[model samples]
Target: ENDNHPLFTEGTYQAEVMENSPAGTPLTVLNGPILALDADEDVYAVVTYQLLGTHSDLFVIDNSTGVVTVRSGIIIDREAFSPPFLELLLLAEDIGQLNGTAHLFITILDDNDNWPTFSPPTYTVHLLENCPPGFPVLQVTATDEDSGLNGELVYRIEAGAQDRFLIHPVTGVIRVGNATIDREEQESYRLTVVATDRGTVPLSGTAIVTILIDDINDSRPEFLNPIQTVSVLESAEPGTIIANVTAIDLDLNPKLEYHIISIVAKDDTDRLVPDQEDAFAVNINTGSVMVKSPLNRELVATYEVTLSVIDNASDLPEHSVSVPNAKLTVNILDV
Candidate 1:
């Protein structure tokens, strides 16, 4: 008995098809145009095609032409498939029931159809000013449902950071740049972080990275004047101001205070043991040089004083800075 099996020239087919293809769309072929035949004449030579297996409902075949098409109402999405493909069992039979079977493997083509999504989508972080240039700030992340190139995300600083920050394109980690972060100049930053997929057309997602720069004592208080000179009557009583001092600082919220470092009192006479009275002091809070005791021109004609300015720097006494000492000359005149 000679075997006359129907020849399945159509063979394995359907190399690929784009995801989201509409129903009735034809799939691409691999080494096949979907064809088969038999040499037996009349009814014996006729052949028919049919799709078998659970996935059979997803497709249909033109029994006469051996053409296969996607089933109605079932659009394919790449993310829905485990291996991202389909295995269709195709069977061809002749009129005498002599039949053959083959596999029609269809791969789902990838497309830039998914948009990147960021978890939380926003961030607020605090950083100390004047930190090291490479100090780590924070990390961000984004994800896409699509696979491969369409799912991989790249990070970048889109805007509003002012070049004070740097981000890793692949890791999404942010760090301080070489530029200084001075809270006195700019307090906070609202940065835009963008994540883009590596797809052909690329889809992007945006998130807000809010950075608050903490303050530090980076600047010292400076004396506005090198020295200040003032005159007061010899009869001036205690608490009378003889001179005033002022200083400026660049630090934010400076707590400025004045101090009377030293005082020297001298008389115009070439005399014996002169008066050692503590005749003057200063207003520590107001930077005012005032009389601690009664002033006498005959006993002390002039007084030389050293004044110092300081910024407490948020009450952190250890971090305080005392500026260069200034001079104050209080000349007592006879009234």
Candidate 2:
């Protein structure tokens, strides 16, 4: 047979290795470890292999067996280079010193080694107390360095949202969860946001978001008790105290104003006995009902009046009827 020089067994060699593969991991072709041979039958020339060219520093070869394996004492990260695929060259030398060269292309596989990171670790914002359901509150963004599924992210609110807030999984936008926010009930909230990557072994990051709710005039004044009945002597002088009216409102700040919404002297069917409208009045601020005119109970043994309380009077005519009304029945005893 004719003499032949050393040559690589594989016409094209390629491999896929994990980026952090340790030393001694063999680089293989579909057939097994990359190989080289000298084809000479009479006196077969002893052949050896050498890895060269770009990325050659990452690997070594068995000179006698021509087996290629990873080199020790170095770490590899796929993202460290512009192109993750490594282009290498392989050399096969025989006893006579004649050699052959071939291309060795390797692909670096990815690992879920990166933790998701938020652009800003903390956030703060203010929201109107009466915001409607589904109103957008704020947005958060996170990133992962790993590629493929490891880079995909999903967002969630882990705690303190309290059914008042919800977040989009992909968009990272938080929105109002209920048409149910009142500054008087809860003034502020803190939400814990987490971004998790879609990896075999997932990694996550966390962020804090604080929200403060501003107050509005959405609450109405309510009397401690809706109605009251009292006995007032006809001898009660003008400006004498008749009854004490009390009310409360659910707001950060309130300015209460008590007014006589309606009045009647006596009852026919009794809903309204429009005899005289001028009977008594309520102190605008003190909520104390007082005798504005002389009370001659003999002229009227019973007087019915509806007293209303409101927190704000800027537009009293428009919403005054919505507040609670106090009903007082004044009874006069015989002397």
Candidate 3:
């Protein structure tokens, strides 16, 4: 129930400024747009407005821009006011304080200077080797200085590119349309991008983008010189370690395991047999060869070993090693 007129003798709306300030006191009575009242009657004013709320607009008078700076959306009803208004007291409209104050000043202004911007400006997206052109590569987004129609802007890719790529005029999305790329000819391209706004003069900006085509393992490693040489001592025993041969392969995963099964010698008199105790065993994981069998150099003053090497990775289309069957000439000296 609303206590409209507690003092029934004073009539329903015979408003009065109570001697002691209460929550429901009518401070400034505006019964109607009628006769003027005493303006100098030191009456208490009820601060019922918010400092910063949904519909609260605390305007800070700026000397330069001549516009009031206000916070976007914040409500603080309990604000301190200076003298003559509330006697340096804090008025809280949210809490229904009797004779309080709610005074605030917003003093910061943001000028509509910084236009829309794309952080990376320009960049590229890589696709699989088999991906068809016209596929969506990447989407470019931009932020504007002004909001809504005044600051709400559009995006588009202008100039910079001829026919290699396409961009969505409204979204600044750069993509390709059935464009084929050949690594042998050129690996990458320089792209230019531009962004514009729906402003009066149509303010615009530019960004340069460079896209590089990643390489796929198509070419195998070729040996610079097909032949390599090694030497051993005549006094080498069956268990003596011999020469270690190495080959180069430019392919992604190379097969380098090798073994000597035959010896093509210039002199048939010099027979060679793989030392069973010190035979050659390849470290399959590391592509290195270690002596598995022993050697007795006295039986043959010099031996020439012809070995065969094979690739390790079996998953690739060209699975086998490049120089699968290579020749290694070994010579022995008298210790």
Candidate 4:
């Protein structure tokens, strides 16, 4: 091996030998060929050695200058070198000039270090429900802070939601193909993503994406037409439609409903939902109003009142509105 101590030939070894040729002995072929010598008429004996080391280029003997010249790049098989130490051998091209074998040391180093990172660090995007299919939602990007192949960053959807999103690994671009946002269904959703570096054992980073849904006026309230004014003598039927007020709501499923906020006057003075404190009461589907208690025109004498109606039309399960107040007057005469 190139790392072993040099050994001289049988009697050919002289304490102070100069210009000694193998003469009659045949050349020896080493297994790993640490060094090889050949005798020729012109160049004399030429010796070659195989170097086992990483990053250390193989050097050949310069018959003229006796200096080593780059033969091949430094890169040897693991089994070729022991642990961290590498093997190299000395060479003498002049056989007639005489020069035994020599040994040299070599070492190999490692190259691998990098980290993962994001490109923009953050991004803001917007989308609409009616924005059709294949619409662009948002583009998220990331990169590796590392170098070489170890620094390559790949992207992927990490959490918050699956099936609804995806991203390009190498490019780190995120895309959402389909989405149906029903304000009535859900307002928003949050998403999390991860970016990993391309390495034997990749390193990764994470980012959060917040999606806010805007509200659209997809619902309208139904209004009652020809709202009327009614009058009755001090004595009239017990039950009556009176100024029957009706309304409609063009919303989904559970439609709009009517509510009375105040009854300024009733039965002339026209009292509101007395005692009930609700001012007045009305039905949602039927837009019907009924007296909570008995009404006596005599006690009320000439009564006057104002009424306001409202509707509850909201996408949310709960919401409502009331109508502006109106003027109403009634008169009662003694016969």
lDDT, model 3: 0.44
Q: What lDDT would candidate 1 get against the real structure? A: 0.81
Q: Tell me each candidate's TM-score.
A: 0.82, 0.80, 0.39, 0.38
Model 2, which residues run further than 4 Å from truth? Answer: 1-5, 39-44, 95-97, 129-133, 159-165, 177-189, 266-278, 313-322, 333-335
**lDDT tens digits, residues 1-335, model 3?**
22121111111111122122333322332232112111121232212322233223332223222122233343222212211121111123212233223222221222234466777776775643323677666677777654334355565555545466687878677777666654334566677676666655565666666656554544444434346566755445543445555556544455556555566433335554444323444443433444443444455444455555555553445635554455556565556
| Model 3 lDDT, residue 93, Cα | 29
Q: Residue 180 deviation, candidate 1, in Å?
A: 2.7
Instruction: Judging by TM-score, tell me the better candidate of 1 and 3.
Output: 1
- lDDT winner, 2 or 4: 2
lDDT of 2 by residue, 1-335 (tens): 43788777776688777878889987655555677767787455677788788678888878788667788997778878657788878788876678887777888888888899987899999998878899999999998989999899999999999888999999999999975987878999999999999999999999999999987766777888677888887788878888988888766677788888777675323343454677888898988988777766446667777888776742334433435588887775555
- For 1-335, candidate 1 gives per-residue lDDT tens digits of 21466677756776678888788887787776777667676777777988888667777799988777787978778888888888888888987688877778889898889889888889999998888898999999988999999999999999987888999999999999899888878889999999999998989999999999887876767778767777888989987777778877777788888887777777767342244436677677778777888877888888777888878764455445555678988887997
Give the deviation of candidate 3 from the true structure as CA RMSD.
15.6
lDDT for each residue of candidate 4 in 1-335, tens digit (9 for 90 to 100):
13222232321211111111122221122223233344344344444333233333533444443333334433323233345354454444343444555554433222234346565565555544444545556767665544555566667777764455566666655655476554445555577778777667767777777665565535444445424444445454334434445555443443455555444443444454233323234554565654433345555444333444344435433233423334334343443
The lDDT values for all models are: 0.81, 0.80, 0.44, 0.46
Cα RMSD of all models vs. native, in order, equals 3.8, 3.9, 15.6, 15.3
Model 3 stretches astray by more than 4 angstroms: 1-116, 119-126, 129-136, 141-193, 196-202, 205-226, 246-280, 286-315, 323-326
